[model samples]
Target: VQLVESGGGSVQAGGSLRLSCAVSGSTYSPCTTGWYRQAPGKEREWVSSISSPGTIYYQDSVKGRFTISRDNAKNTVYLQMNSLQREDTGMYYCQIQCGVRSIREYWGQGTQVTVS
Candidate 1:
């Protein structure tokens, strides 16, 4: 019962990127897809979210830079961003949350993103 994220990625300067994650367990209810990031020595911050009812939400700090989506039939989620700034370098996480629950149910190990 865990979330496995795709491998780390490299970006030449600043550009576009996509991340993938999959879960090995089952959920009792419909789930929502979320993306977050944790920089070194800093608390994780929410990037984006797509609710079970098909509503999308984004954090003001990261607004317009990210897009979040899910593929429930495949038990997977995708996180994508465009025009990434070098400062965007950090560990990106894929999260799963129950639609009607108060908290997240699982998180991936996190995929590393570095700017070159």
Candidate 2:
């Protein structure tokens, strides 16, 4: 399992980016991964998430700067942001979602890719 960021693999603000998170340990179908943010004095918010077979589920009211995608064939998931802002700087993570309802039950250790 691996999460790779596009463009020489670094999160840079104001640049279009693609981040991928992958898993190789589940037999479950309709798999999904959730994206999260952890700031200085706040809790984790569900930024956006995507499922295998390429279904994007996102949270409203977050200004729509984030998008998610996945490819099961390559065992990978992607998080994308266009024209990223400084407020976008934080610890971004990806995790496996079980069933429906956007709850990430089994989780990856979470790759902390920061934007600057």
Candidate 3:
């Protein structure tokens, strides 16, 4: 049970992008998910999260332009954003919160994105 990243490519400034991952080797509905990104040699910046009950939250950096969602039926989760900017370039990922303690552990391979 882990996240497998999918969907990637470059987008121009002001364009839109969607990055996603698949939940492998486990059921999906019971999970809480989060999205984040890391620039080279830098710490990740968490941007979005969705609880098992479907409550959504986003970090201030992406509060208005970013969104996160999941399809339990497909065991997939994705992050989307509009109005891409150069600073959006990074390796974007999804993580699963494992155990009732809600510790984030399972992580995706991540997708590289660049906004030119």
Candidate 4:
């Protein structure tokens, strides 16, 4: 699987953040990626989820400051965050829900995010 996120972006306490993650492989039609927040010792939580570029979805918990986008043509996906906060600072992973459960059954290692 393949995942990509924005290398450059600015987020303020009450501002907005935009992160991008893309998935690539032999099959990407049924493929989809979602954002996750991995705390120190707690299990990861679903931040956002997006299907094809035309079909974007998100979890209710992060609906306040999360936006997931995709580019089916380019086979790329994007994640956006808004109203930044200290708690928002953590490692974000791009996961593909490629199993019975629409979750990171198969996931890309992860990407570190610094909200400073």
Best by lDDT: 3
In order, the Cα lDDT scores of the candidates are: 0.79, 0.62, 0.83, 0.65
Measured by TM-score, how close is model 3 to the native structure? 0.89
lDDT by residue for model 4 (1-116), tens: 66555543435566665666656565533655677877667788777776655566676756657777776687666677777776776677777766444434566666665566
Runs of candidate 3 exceeding 4 Å displacement? 27-29, 101-104
- The candidate, 3 or 4, that scores higher on TM-score is 3
Over 17-100, each residue of candidate 2 has an lDDT whose tens digit, in order, gives 766666666554455577776666768778787654555677673447767766658877677777776676656666665655
Identify the candidate with maximal TM-score.
3
| Lowest summed lDDT window (length 10), candidate 2 | 1-10
lDDT of 4: 0.65
- The full ranking of all candidates by lDDT, starting with the best, is 3, 1, 4, 2
Candidate 2 to truth, TM: 0.70
* Ten contiguous residues with the weakest lDDT in model 4: 3-12
Ranking by TM-score: 3, 1, 4, 2
Off by over 4 Å in 2: 1-12, 52-54, 61-64, 99-104
What are the RMSD figures for all models against the true structure? 2.2, 4.0, 2.0, 3.5
List TM-scores for all candidates, in order.
0.83, 0.70, 0.89, 0.72
Which scores greater on lDDT, model 3 or model 4? 3
Provide backbone clash counts, one per model.
0, 0, 0, 3
